[PDB]
């Protein structure tokens, strides 16, 4: 790789500087380099990886939506289709890269439950992004790959984590978005979101000092989605 | 070039779609392709060229400032200097490209006064951006190149345009920023900004329907700078 000659510690240091400069493509490329050294990621390093790639595909998804909607209003030439296809191909490339890193280096049968749930949630998120732009018989394959990763993550977090854990809360929030937008199961989405909120409020005594901010933010987002789906 | 096989009309169409999707790198590359066909740009096309490249270098300048300030707080390793140099080199590449297009294709002895002033202002803006990151004896050469382009633009706009013309107003606004930030002449900056505002207000009867929005915006920015420099 292009980062093969740089020290692991230097790549992590530069990913942080790229975050502060809002240079998210650079950030993602530095973290890919770090992962390719073959060592495990710390809790802090996992978050750098996630923030980098989330910001890159987020910008691609927003552009793809603007162009896809303009394309449909034509019903002008081949130009809109051509440019929409170009952004699509680039988005698919980024998703394939992240999923490649998850299968090659990061997902393991061992490690703590925080680690395994984090990478399986990530695996679900990026199959979900591929599902938003797919159409064929492969779309059905992609949706079942997303559901499967999300469901194994849910099973582990119910056994191993308290209901106020922010990784458990975020997982359930995104899996409920999967139900509503991709699976067309709005009842199953509403249900999952309400019980996630309710079960956290019933066992507030488990709330940790170090994740008061993160957990609270995700509770508000769960409620905002329920307001919208009523 | 990479856009050599595409029709002129298709490149202009795709630059507009890229604007709507906030894909400013694509936008700039499509407009470079359009310029390289060798025909003049319309008023609307000139604005597409300007908006594309302004947005690209704007993001680079903001990152360069965040990293340059972090670097100075070290007084930790070579990592901050190395990454700051990388963003700098990339910023200089974009400025050289724009200045190359201006000298090769766009700046002419003929054409209307709106055209000539527009490209000379652009020439000043991008030498100004190179001056922000330069240090040596070449910095002095770069500042004099910026002043010279800006001054020839001012001379033409005073003879050929009314004092409420938004291209004339924008030119003077940016030339006053050049005085304050790059030339360290805060008196000369304050003076130019006040007389630009005052002379527009004295001759309000020249204000055009098609530029009421643009001219008004730039008047407010001239006043906001004066509030700051008092
Ligand atoms: O240092 P931490 O334990 O990791 O948590 C704090 C943070 C921060 C803190 O200070 P700051 O937000 O003024 O910049 C704090 C904390 C701890 C110490 C201080 C703070 C303040 C507060 C809480 C925890 C913390 C509880 C009570 C108060 C608060 C407001 C909103 C939600 C949760 C809380 C920064 C840095 C970090 C943080 C996180 C966020 C945000 C900002 C921060 C933004 C985006 C996200 C967030 C969630 C909810 C509301 C607003 C935000
Ligand atoms: O169609 P145009 O003649 O080119 O001008 C109008 C515009 C627009 C118009 O509608 P909009 O701003 O509600 O979206 C208008 C015009 C003409 C017709 C309507 C409008 C409204 C107004 C004016 C001119 C126009 C004068 C009086 C009122 C106004 C408010 C602020 C500054 C100047 C004006 C859009 C599109 C365009 C425009 C430009 C701007 C903006 C928005 C627009 C933003 C960013 C910049 C701006 C400058 C000052 C304040 C706010 C803005
Ligand atoms: Cl294209
Ligand atoms: Cl670097």
UniProtKB/Swiss-Prot annotation, chains A, B:
UniProt modified residues of type Phosphoserine: 10
Localization: Cytoplasm; Nucleus; Secreted
SUPFAM superfamilies: 14-3-3 protein
Post-translational modification: Ubiquitinated. Ubiquitination by RFFL induces proteasomal degradation and indirectly regulates p53/TP53 activation.
Signal peptide as annotated in the record: none
Keyword Secreted annotated: yes
CDD domains: 14-3-3_sigma
InterPro entries: 14-3-3 (IPR000308), 14-3-3_CS (IPR023409), 14-3-3_dom_sf (IPR036815), 14-3-3_domain (IPR023410), 14-3-3_sigma (IPR037435)
Keyword Transcription regulation: no
GO process terms (BP): cAMP/PKA signal transduction; establishment of skin barrier; intrinsic apoptotic signaling pathway in response to DNA damage; keratinization; keratinocyte development; keratinocyte proliferation; negative regulation of innate immune response; negative regulation of keratinocyte proliferation
Main location: cytoplasm
Site (described: Interaction with phosphoserine on interacting protein): 61, 128
GO cellular component term, pick one: cytosol
Gene Ontology molecular function: cadherin binding; identical protein binding; phosphoserine residue binding; protein kinase binding; protein kinase C inhibitor activity; protein sequestering activity
Keyword entries, A-Z: Cytoplasm, Nucleus, Phosphoprotein, Secreted, Ubl conjugation
Top-rank taxon, per record: Eukaryota
Expression tissues: Present mainly in tissues enriched in stratified squamous keratinizing epithelium.
UniProt family annotation: Belongs to the 14-3-3 family.
Function noted in UniProt: Adapter protein implicated in the regulation of a large spectrum of both general and specialized signaling pathways. Binds to a large number of partners, usually by recognition of a phosphoserine or phosphothreonine motif. Binding generally results in the modulation of the activity of the binding partner. Promotes cytosolic retention of GBP1 GTPase by binding to phosphorylated GBP1, thereby inhibiting the innate immune response. Also acts as a TP53/p53-regulated inhibitor of G2/M progression.
Assembly: Homodimer. Interacts with KRT17 and SAMSN1. Found in a complex with XPO7, EIF4A1, ARHGAP1, VPS26A, VPS29 and VPS35. Interacts with GAB2. Interacts with SRPK2. Interacts with COPS6. Interacts with COP1; this interaction leads to proteasomal degradation. Interacts with the 'Thr-369' phosphorylated form of DAPK2. Interacts with PI4KB. Interacts with SLITRK1. Interacts with LRRK2; this interaction is dependent on LRRK2 phosphorylation.
Protein name: 14-3-3 protein sigma
Lineage: Eukaryota, Metazoa, Chordata, Craniata, Vertebrata
């Amino acid at each position: 790789g292009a980062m093969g000659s740089m020290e692991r510690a230097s790549l992590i240091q530069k990913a942080k500087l790229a975050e502060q400069a809002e240079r998210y493509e650079d950030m993602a490329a530095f973290m890919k380099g770090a992962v390719e050294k073959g060592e495990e990621l710390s809790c802090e390093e996992r978050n750098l990886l996630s923030v980098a790639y989330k910001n890159v595909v987020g910008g691609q998804r927003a552009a793809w939506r603007v162009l896809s909607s303009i394309e449909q209003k034509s019903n002008k030439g081949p130009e809109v289709r051509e440019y929409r296809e170009k952004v699509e191909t680039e988005l698919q490339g980024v998703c394939d890269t992240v999923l490649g890193l998850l299968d090659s280096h990061l997902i393991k049968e061992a490690g703590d439950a925080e680690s395994r749930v984090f990478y399986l949630k990530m695996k679900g998120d990026y199959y979900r992004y591929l599902a938003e732009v797919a159409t064929g018989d492969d779309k059905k394959r992609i949706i079942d790959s997303a559901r499967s990763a999300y469901q194994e993550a849910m099973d582990i977090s119910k056994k191993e984590m308290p209901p106020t854990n922010p990784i458990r809360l975020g997982l359930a929030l995104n899996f409920s978005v999967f139900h509503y937008e991709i699976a067309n199961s709005p009842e199953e989405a509403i249900s999952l979101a309400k019980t996630t909120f309710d079960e956290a409020m019933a066992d507030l005594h488990t709330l940790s000092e170090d994740s008061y901010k993160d957990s609270t933010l995700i509770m508000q987002l769960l409620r905002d989605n329920l307001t919208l789906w009523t």
